[PDB]
Enzyme design. Structure first.
Site, mmCIF file in Angstrom:
data_model
loop_
_atom_site.group_PDB
_atom_site.id
_atom_site.type_symbol
_atom_site.label_atom_id
_atom_site.label_comp_id
_atom_site.label_asym_id
_atom_site.label_seq_id
_atom_site.Cartn_x
_atom_site.Cartn_y
_atom_site.Cartn_z
ATOM 1 N N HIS A 94 -6.269 -7.258 -11.235
ATOM 2 C CA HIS A 94 -5.096 -6.415 -11.131
ATOM 3 C C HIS A 94 -3.879 -6.945 -11.901
ATOM 4 O O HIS A 94 -2.781 -6.477 -11.682
ATOM 5 C CB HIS A 94 -4.676 -6.250 -9.664
ATOM 6 C CG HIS A 94 -5.703 -5.632 -8.767
ATOM 7 N ND1 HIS A 94 -5.644 -4.311 -8.378
ATOM 8 C CD2 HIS A 94 -6.779 -6.171 -8.132
ATOM 9 C CE1 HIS A 94 -6.642 -4.062 -7.541
ATOM 10 N NE2 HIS A 94 -7.348 -5.173 -7.379
ATOM 11 N N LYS A 149 10.123 0.470 -6.361
ATOM 12 C CA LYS A 149 9.051 -0.503 -6.649
ATOM 13 C C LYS A 149 9.634 -1.880 -6.380
ATOM 14 O O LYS A 149 10.855 -2.047 -6.303
ATOM 15 C CB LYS A 149 8.529 -0.418 -8.088
ATOM 16 C CG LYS A 149 9.601 -0.466 -9.167
ATOM 17 C CD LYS A 149 9.110 -0.142 -10.585
ATOM 18 C CE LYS A 149 8.727 1.308 -10.814
ATOM 19 N NZ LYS A 149 7.279 1.505 -11.068
ATOM 20 N N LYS A 184 9.230 -5.165 -14.548
ATOM 21 C CA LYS A 184 9.408 -3.747 -14.219
ATOM 22 C C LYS A 184 10.740 -3.166 -14.743
ATOM 23 O O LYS A 184 10.944 -1.931 -14.746
ATOM 24 C CB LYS A 184 9.271 -3.523 -12.706
ATOM 25 C CG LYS A 184 7.848 -3.775 -12.161
ATOM 26 C CD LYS A 184 7.762 -3.544 -10.660
ATOM 27 C CE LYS A 184 6.485 -4.017 -9.980
ATOM 28 N NZ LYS A 184 5.389 -3.045 -10.164
ATOM 29 N N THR A 238 0.873 2.633 -9.428
ATOM 30 C CA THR A 238 0.445 3.731 -8.571
ATOM 31 C C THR A 238 1.606 4.598 -8.067
ATOM 32 O O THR A 238 1.416 5.782 -7.799
ATOM 33 C CB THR A 238 -0.353 3.221 -7.344
ATOM 34 O OG1 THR A 238 0.432 2.234 -6.678
ATOM 35 C CG2 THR A 238 -1.646 2.639 -7.762
ATOM 36 N N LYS A 276 2.100 8.899 -7.577
ATOM 37 C CA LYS A 276 2.723 9.560 -6.413
ATOM 38 C C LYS A 276 3.795 10.534 -6.837
ATOM 39 O O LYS A 276 3.913 11.638 -6.274
ATOM 40 C CB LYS A 276 3.338 8.537 -5.448
ATOM 41 C CG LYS A 276 2.327 7.512 -4.907
ATOM 42 C CD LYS A 276 2.995 6.369 -4.153
ATOM 43 C CE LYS A 276 2.084 5.165 -4.044
ATOM 44 N NZ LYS A 276 2.794 4.068 -3.443
HETATM 45 N N1 LIG Z 1 1.074 -5.228 -10.516
HETATM 46 C C1 LIG Z 1 -0.176 -4.521 -10.163
HETATM 47 C C2 LIG Z 1 -0.027 -3.007 -10.365
HETATM 48 O O1 LIG Z 1 0.164 -2.672 -11.753
HETATM 49 C C3 LIG Z 1 -1.257 -2.272 -9.867
HETATM 50 O O2 LIG Z 1 -1.015 -0.850 -9.850
HETATM 51 C C4 LIG Z 1 -1.652 -2.738 -8.453
HETATM 52 C C5 LIG Z 1 -2.951 -2.090 -8.013
HETATM 53 O O3 LIG Z 1 -3.992 -2.254 -8.980
HETATM 54 O O4 LIG Z 1 -1.776 -4.164 -8.390
HETATM 55 C C6 LIG Z 1 -0.550 -4.832 -8.703
HETATM 56 C C7 LIG Z 1 -0.771 -6.271 -8.463
HETATM 57 N N2 LIG Z 1 -0.351 -6.967 -7.392
HETATM 58 C C8 LIG Z 1 -0.785 -8.250 -7.530
HETATM 59 C C9 LIG Z 1 -0.529 -9.360 -6.571
HETATM 60 C C10 LIG Z 1 -0.055 -9.059 -5.292
HETATM 61 C C11 LIG Z 1 0.224 -10.077 -4.376
HETATM 62 C C12 LIG Z 1 0.000 -11.400 -4.732
HETATM 63 C C13 LIG Z 1 -0.473 -11.703 -6.008
HETATM 64 C C14 LIG Z 1 -0.744 -10.695 -6.928
HETATM 65 C C15 LIG Z 1 -1.471 -8.335 -8.721
HETATM 66 N N3 LIG Z 1 -1.452 -7.104 -9.266
HETATM 67 C C1 LIG Z 2 2.977 2.924 -4.224
HETATM 68 C C2 LIG Z 2 3.869 1.867 -3.670
HETATM 69 C C3 LIG Z 2 4.162 0.678 -4.470
HETATM 70 C C4 LIG Z 2 3.652 0.549 -5.892
HETATM 71 O O1 LIG Z 2 4.619 1.158 -6.780
HETATM 72 P P1 LIG Z 2 4.596 0.756 -8.360
HETATM 73 O O2 LIG Z 2 5.683 1.655 -8.880
HETATM 74 O O3 LIG Z 2 3.209 1.126 -8.840
HETATM 75 O O4 LIG Z 2 4.940 -0.700 -8.425
HETATM 76 C C5 LIG Z 2 4.998 -0.309 -3.928
HETATM 77 N N1 LIG Z 2 5.473 -0.198 -2.686
HETATM 78 C C6 LIG Z 2 5.270 0.851 -1.881
HETATM 79 C C7 LIG Z 2 5.886 0.886 -0.517
HETATM 80 C C8 LIG Z 2 4.412 1.946 -2.310
HETATM 81 O O5 LIG Z 2 4.132 3.028 -1.545
#
Ligand SMILES: N[C@@H]1[C@@H](O)[C@H](O)[C@@H](CO)O[C@H]1c1nc(-c2ccccc2)c[nH]1
Ligand SMILES: *Cc1c(COP(=O)(O)O)cnc(C)c1O
Ligand SMILES: O=c1[nH]cnc2c1ncn2[C@@H]1O[C@@H](COP(=O)(O)O)[C@@H](O)[C@H]1O
Ligand SMILES: O=c1[nH]cnc2c1ncn2[C@@H]1O[C@@H](COP(=O)(O)O)[C@@H](O)[C@H]1O
Ligand SMILES: N[C@@H]1[C@@H](O)[C@H](O)[C@@H](CO)O[C@H]1c1nc(-c2ccccc2)c[nH]1
Ligand SMILES: *Cc1c(COP(=O)(O)O)cnc(C)c1O
EC number: 2.4.1.1
Lengths: 810, 810
Positions: A351, A542, A548, A650, A654
């Site tokens: 991810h 976000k 970002k 994601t 939405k």
């Molecule tokens: N930034 C991406 C985001 O682009 C992506 O939509 C999401 C779901 O695939 O995963 C997020 C993500 N989160 C982590 C993460 C979360 C907590 C601890 C360490 C890594 C790695 N990647």
């Molecule tokens: C969907 C969602 C995210 C992820 O949003 P990104 O714009 O893809 O970073 C983060 N936090 C909450 C509470 C969400 O529902």
């Protein structure tokens, strides 16, 4: 009231009413004379929960009898949000419950607001896991989510003097009616100790034991009577733990701390011992459960035919060496057979490509905590590199690059390399991201084993993210094309036939307007802030991150303010700019960005020349429940990460589903969204990945943009000189210094194109008919971004199971 | 089956069966194919709990409407035991539940065995509090028990190699179906801080806050539809507590440790800061609740007309200065008015005269933890001593003796002196004890305020300690005199008319024999030990203490062994000697006594010359549930404390009710038991209080007894030389040294009379008809020892309320 909320039959309503009163009396032990709204919420939750139970028992029985292949989704995070409304939607009980409560003198919408979010995640990764559980149940898969039951989820954010303060999220204080403790299925997990080599193999001895107690939560599918299980482990000390007497009992906390708190970092690796304990705890308990269930259905050759383990990033990567440990040390399989089983069972989803987010554990931590696992990792590495050497003879640098063990001051294990080696499938989460994996960070692995590498573009569940949060939109769609789209989102393409229909155009715009009024009133009530609901709602929600680029949004907002102040009597399209998100508590720059946003608000919102033409609001405590309110209200979705940095996103999806247009870079899933809707129906700007690479090759010099763009120079001079912090003129110097000298994310390089693109947005907003037609084109092409689509692809291409829309009997 | 267990009507049985199945499905989320006995226990508990709820709600409503005077019983300990059977007995559901479960294929007695004891006490004091709650509900008093919900109650005792090992009592692991969390009534409690003196009085500022969250447990009266409340407080950190981030969340344990564990000392003071925190926590939360309830029914003159606070020993003594704090600092009453209210509200029960059990807190602890309370205590002391000086002018030594503040290396507060000063009534717990209080330790206080001093002889509830644990005895009594005795135990006197009735004699002996067989089988099943059920069951169960003289029992057992070995072919009445009880974990001598008992068993039980004529068994993990099994099986009750040391005793009364004869000293309530039954029907021996005093005046010399009694000399030589510890010959040297040189409890001085009295017991046991006639005389005169009698006396003579046997409507 509305059709997609289901039937309110007289017998159903009567039965809900009597069960509500039964729970208030017997379960809550209250009479109506002292009951509070919270008591009424609990009585409704218990009433609705009773309808899940028969289906839950029947579903789990059906899996025991039929013995399908089981899918285990392992994650450190499940960002579930509230459960009450989602359960009613999935069981077709929403209208009946509305009526039942109405007849008792209660407003169900008010009761729904009392429920705490289950905040057991940081953002996108955790929320993806939640959407996936919903889709797996809806598609009839024998799927289990396994994680940790954190006592404290993601912190509650308060803003004080414009700064983020954190408070503990004591989400279990009033109880959780959705979970069922299963203390009878408690299992031991081992830590520390040492390895003894006997004549009959290795033995891990002298360990400390922590117990893993499971709590099960039902996961209902959409109207198919399938209820799957999310099993979350809680840490408990054994009764002889440390057993002067009083201190030994108090020291049980040392063991129980494992499940106390969610690490609050999004897309960032913090290599602390407690985190490693968490990762092993979830893996070790889960794998015992998996093996128990497999044996109750000797011959591990059939294991991969009955079990799939999906690793949600590298966080549960210890599953690979733990599975080997169990098969080799305990079941006494030979290494080669065990490895075959392991590889065919496990699959890894990546991810992120940001280097600071990749897990690289110091060897000394693993040596102390998990000495047998370290030995197994070394053996995996040696056998893996023997394959590399045979495929690419003499390529010694490739051996260094591909090693699971990284050399240096501190030797580390690269967990991503471990996951690739031990998995039959490796996927990224959007097409551009999966390509980047093959071209850059995992290029060597792709050359060795090209067949492993796949793409599975992310999605969101249309139950929570359309039907639940935006019933008005769901209804006007259902009036035209029926209800089937809710579990087959591709049917939204039929809406392209209505793009010239005046009644549909009017209805789409009316629903947005209602959602905006409803959100504007929520803001006034809960936060004492007044906004103009005729303005364009420009929304960036976000987690707060440099990549970002909330800062790029900030530069645009200041540009607009400065343009108004220069020509105050010229018309401009009114905007309400809303930015929200949590900063990780140790992430200093993210905390400074929040402060900048509130400081801009303090100037802009109180300037009488601006009026109601520009407002800047920081949305406090952004979380799943707040997303459900703000996303249906948005006109413009800001998806403005530097190309190559956001693996998917994601939130983007939405907003598309809910009738916002998108301003964004060609990053993550934005690329596929634009492709589905048509580039003409998307506000694309900025550097592509290739342009970022070209700039990195010649060297990014921010001074060049400062020297060439007067509007940008003015903003930097305002920041530097204390215009937005008159009492502390140097407050933002770290932000200025970063932008000018150490900006990894090239904010200035996309500034001019961003501002110009924002002008095109404003021009389109002036023509409401054409704005709305473009919206219809976006909603109509959003079908690809259903998590039902994503999960069907995992099922067919990775897990080897067939989805099903067939209902179990009621 | 038996009449006193109530009716099993067809409709009742049908309804219990369907509710049992409802709870198994909906509450437990199990189907019958995987349910365990534990699941069945929970389904029954929930079914029975549902019958409490309507009565509980109605009772608490009735108190709100009628507004009677409320009784608050404050205790650090409530030793409740199991709840399921007691609830069925009090609601007349036992036979219906037996039938309902039988028809479902289940054995209710087996389900009852699954329930954990609620072990929130050490022994007698905690168990007295539990009996009192049962009697207060049965007598229709608006009474509330207030305490702490300890996560870990009294430790589980394991015996390993003859030594006590302790394990945590994780009593809440599987859940507690009887309690209801009330997080909505959470209250703040303050610690530390400092006092500021403003122009408008004192202010306690800069405090640390811990939240007190209440859990409520129903307390059913006997067949009167009254259900009172036991409210137990649990400690919770506030959400901003310590608010890097992760550590701040983990450090919430520092606050929550307050309610983690029960201090495991019986009749002993351990002056630790955590204990002091516990004492204040319970007092501060409770008093806020009391005041809230009083205001919802400005003018505190009526406070003592609506509120009584009974202090269970000095453990909640901080109620006195806390009440003053609230009235003076917060409600702004003048001191004199506040003190009048406080004194009329509070009453103090003393439960010990042993100096090591009296609470004397170092001033430095109170100064740091509770600085305002220390100031109030000093002011109380100064005003109190001003009264003493005016009553006894020039008596400067009396001023020193009566001071609440004790001088020395460390200044301490004497909490007993505080309780006497601030209470309108002070009572002891048996006649001899209340006299000792007036003659010795509180003589000065009695001379100043003779009107305060009362006696309230302890009692036990005949519901738990006859009907529940010995249904066979209850039934044969009920056949003769009806059922009214269960709530009017004085009716047992009618049994004196049956002392020459051959059928009754036979039935009494038959019930004892059945209880002995049942206990002998329990021992074999759960502990792999075989006993002769024709032997005299000689039982000493109570906490292990020097003053309770388990050692004197040990000397008798060795004497019997030595007499058998000397004349092996002479007849002796066979005995099974059973000793059980927990030692406090830090009490070294008590731990050595346990080891001696098991070491004697190791020799006696394996000597082939002894045979089945003498067996010595250490009963492991003595607790309320084990008392309910062993007490109905006993022939001889050992109540052998040194005269003047056991304030009352209550085990003594349990044995009397259940058809054991008593061998005992004239100590505590033994004096009144002998008076009620006739001294001819009791095995009295040893020094009286007066004889102990005479020995202390000339000086106790143990060597004199050693020199004069050959049988005693032989035992000491066996102990010293390693006869009972061949591998560690010096193992018992501390015990020998204590007996010979530092014995505060004069074991040798009662030895000769004890052995001679034991010979009279054996002689009577040889004549079963006369043994049984003496038993009938004991059971028949046990009525005074009902806690219903005790509570009626508190109600009339201390609280100023009238008991009632009238039923609330169902
Ligand atoms: N930034 C991406 C985001 O682009 C992506 O939509 C999401 C779901 O695939 O995963 C997020 C993500 N989160 C982590 C993460 C979360 C907590 C601890 C360490 C890594 C790695 N990647
Ligand atoms: C969907 C969602 C995210 C992820 O949003 P990104 O714009 O893809 O970073 C983060 N936090 C909450 C509470 C969400 O529902
Ligand atoms: O040995 C068994 N006999 C009957 N049913 C079983 C057995 N083992 C599992 N099941 C069924 O499937 C179970 C689901 O729990 P699991 O053990 O987590 O798979 C139970 O709830 C039963 O419905
Ligand atoms: O303000 C009130 N209105 C109506 N009933 C009340 C009120 N306050 C207390 N009660 C009743 O008495 C209460 C018992 O709880 P308490 O507050 O602990 O005394 C409730 O359960 C009600 O039945
Ligand atoms: N020993 C008496 C006993 O004689 C008496 O029957 C019992 C109930 O009054 O209280 C016991 C008692 N227990 C304590 C105690 C308990 C825990 C901590 C400190 C003191 C003091 N007194
Ligand atoms: C009654 C009881 C006690 C008190 O017994 P004494 O002989 O009065 O010390 C102690 N523990 C338990 C479990 C009891 O039931």
């Amino acid at each position: 009231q509305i059709s997609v909320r289901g039937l309110a039959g007289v017998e159903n309503v009567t039965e809900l009413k009597k069960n509500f009163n039964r729970h208030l009396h017997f379960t809550l032990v209250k009479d109506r004379n002292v009951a509070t709204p919270r008591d009424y919420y609990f009585a409704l939750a218990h009433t609705v929960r009773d309808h899940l139970v028969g289906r839950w028992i029947r579903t789990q029985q059906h899996y025991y009898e039929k013995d399908p292949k089981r899918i285990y989704y392992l994650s450190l995070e499940f960002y579930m949000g509230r459960t009450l409304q989602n359960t009613m939607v999935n069981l077709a009980l929403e209208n009946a419950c509305d009526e039942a409560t109405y007849q008792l003198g209660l407003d169900m919408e008010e009761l729904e607001e009392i429920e705490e979010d289950a905040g057991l995640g940081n953002g996108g990764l955790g929320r993806l896991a939640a959407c996936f559980l919903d889709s797996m149940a809806t598609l009839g898969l024998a799927a289990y989510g396994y994680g940790i039951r954190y006592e404290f989820g993601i912190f509650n954010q308060k803003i004080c003097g414009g700064w983020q303060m954190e408070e503990a999220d004591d989400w279990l204080r009033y109880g959780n009616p959705w979970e069922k403790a299963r203390p009878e299925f408690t299992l031991p997990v081992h830590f520390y100790g040492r390895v003894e080599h006997t004549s009959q193999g290795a033995k891990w001895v002298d360990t400390q034991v922590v117990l893993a107690m499971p709590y099960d939560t039902p996961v209902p599918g959409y109207r198919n009577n399938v209820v799957n299980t999310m099993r979350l482990w809680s840490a408990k000390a054994p009764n002889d733990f440390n057993l002067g007497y009083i201190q030994a009992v108090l020291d049980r906390n040392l063991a129980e701390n494992i499940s106390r708190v969610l690490y609050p970092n999004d897309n960032f690796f913090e290599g602390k011992e407690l985190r490693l304990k968490q990762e092993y705890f979830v893996v070790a308990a889960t794998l015992q459960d998996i093996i128990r269930r497999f044996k109750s259905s000797t011959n591990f050759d059939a294991f991969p035919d009955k079990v799939a383990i999906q690793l949600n990033d590298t966080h549960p990567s210890l599953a690979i060496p733990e599975l080997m440990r169990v098969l080799v040390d305990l079941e006494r399989l030979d290494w080669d057979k065990a490895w075959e089983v392991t590889v065919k069972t496990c699959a890894y989803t990546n991810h992120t490509v940001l280097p600071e987010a990749l897990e690289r554990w110091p060897v000394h931590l693993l040596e102390t905590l998990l000495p047998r696992h370290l030995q197994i990792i070394y053996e995996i590495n040696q056998r893996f590199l023997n394959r590399v050497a045979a495929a690419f003879p003499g390529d010694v640098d490739r051996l260094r690059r591909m090693s699971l063990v990284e050399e240096g001051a501190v030797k580390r294990i690269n967990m991503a390399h471990l996951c690739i080696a031990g998995s039959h499938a490796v996927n990224g989460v959007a097409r551009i991201h999966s390509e980047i994996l093959k071209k850059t960070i995992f290029k060597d692995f792709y050359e060795l084993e090209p067949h492993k590498f796949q793409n599975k573009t992310n999605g969101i569940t249309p139950r929570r993210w359309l039907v639940l949060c935006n019933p008005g939109l769901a209804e006007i769609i259902a009036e035209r094309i029926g209800e089937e789209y809710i579990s087959d989102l591709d049917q939204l393409r039929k809406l392209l036939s209505y793009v010239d229909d005046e009644a549909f155009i009017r209805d789409v715009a009316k629903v947005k307007q209602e959602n905006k009024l409803k959100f504007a009133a929520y803001l006034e009530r809960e936060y004492k802030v007044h906004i103009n609901p005729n303005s364009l709602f420009d929304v960036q929600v976000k987690r707060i991150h440099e990549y970002k680029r909330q800062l790029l949004n900030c530069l645009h907002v200041i540009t607009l303010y400065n343009r108004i102040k220069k020509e105050p009597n010229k018309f401009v399209v009114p905007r309400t700019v809303m930015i929200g998100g949590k900063a990780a508590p140790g992430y200093h720059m993210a905390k400074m960005i929040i402060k900048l946003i509130t400081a801009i608000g303090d100037v802009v919102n109180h300037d009488p020349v601006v009026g109601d033409r520009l407002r800047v609001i920081f949305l406090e405590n952004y979380r799943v429940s707040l997303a459900e309110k703000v996303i249906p209200a948005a006109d413009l979705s800001e998806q403005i990460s530097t190309a190559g940095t956001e693996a998917s996103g994601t939130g983007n999806m939405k907003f598309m589903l809910n009738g916002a247009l998108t301003i964004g870079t060609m990053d993550g899933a934005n690329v596929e969204m634009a492709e589905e809707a048509g580039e003409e129906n998307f506000f694309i700007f900025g550097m592509r990945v290739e342009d970022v690479d070209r700039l990195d090759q010649r060297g990014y010099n921010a001074q060049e943009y400062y020297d060439r763009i007067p509007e940008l120079r003015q903003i930097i001079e305002q920041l530097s000189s204390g215009f937005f912090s008159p009492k502390q003129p140097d407050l933002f110097k770290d932000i200025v210094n970063m932008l000018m000298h150490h900006d990894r994310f090239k904010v200035f390089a996309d500034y001019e194109e961003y501002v110009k693109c924002q002008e095109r947005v404003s021009a389109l907003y002036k023509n409401p008919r054409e704005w709305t037609r473009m919206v219809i084109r976006n909603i109509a092409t959003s079908g690809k971004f259903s998590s039902d689509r994503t999960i069907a692809q995992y099922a067919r291409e990775i897990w080897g199971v067939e989805p099903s829309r067939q209902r179990l009997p009621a």
